[PDB]
């Protein structure tokens, strides 16, 4: 199963690794929030990001590309 | 399952599901999803799909994991 | 397997880990930059964004790469 990447807002990016985890990166050069999944919609993830104020403030090929050179916060 | 996601315009998002041979397009958050079937021999480039979206006036006026993530909570229109 | 990301306002990238190549398109109807990558040193999205900006790559194959780059010239760099 090829992972799904999505854009959130103007600079935000998400990687759904159906590894069973989600990686959210608010903007270039900030950070990555790593969440384990048991699967929320893209719209539900966008609200959660804002509600939990996720603004910074061995995982798979796709998550390593997105989150390489930035700190990882496992939540 | 072999799929790919892309951006279109200011807010548009697209999912190409090469296995199921379908395309899901969402013009913006909270709007709708257009589901299209594709012929196995004529998968359209991103440019071709951008023109098709304009030509069909896709302005919102079973499926895989990636399509369900994109289109959860909005109405689906088959074209 | 493959992964797609956005760079700036209109830029799009396809990472093709199976064919060990990167396809960057700076805007619709421009061109695609095709780059070869070493399996032991795949560049991060951060590093590719810098490569794209520093070399001013403004245009002056698998399923996902063909979809992104169909209809525009390819520059192998």
Automatic annotation (TrEMBL), chain C:
Subcellular location per the Swiss-Prot or TrEMBL entry: Secreted, Extracellular space, Surface film
Record GO cellular component, one term: extracellular region
GO BP: any one term: respiratory gaseous exchange by respiratory system
Keyword set, alphabetical order: Disulfide bond, Gaseous exchange, Lipoprotein, Palmitate, Secreted, Surface film
Superkingdom: Eukaryota
Keyword Signal: no
Primary location group: secreted
Record keyword Phosphoprotein present: no
Residue span, BRICHOS domain: 5-77
Function: Pulmonary surfactant associated proteins promote alveolar stability by lowering the surface tension at the air-liquid interface in the peripheral air spaces.
Record protein name field: Surfactant protein C
Shown residues in whole-protein numbering: 37 to 144 of 144
């Amino acid at each position: 199963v090829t992972t799904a990447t999505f854009s959130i807002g103007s600079t935000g990016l998400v990687v759904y690794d159906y590894q069973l985890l989600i990686a959210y990166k608010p903007a270039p050069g900030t950070c990555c929030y790593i969440m384990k999944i048991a699967i929320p919609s893209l719209e539900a993830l966008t609200r959660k990001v804002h509600n939990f104020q996720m603004e910074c403030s061995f995982l798979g090929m796709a998550v390593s590309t997105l989150c390489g050179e930035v700190p990882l916060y496992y939540i």
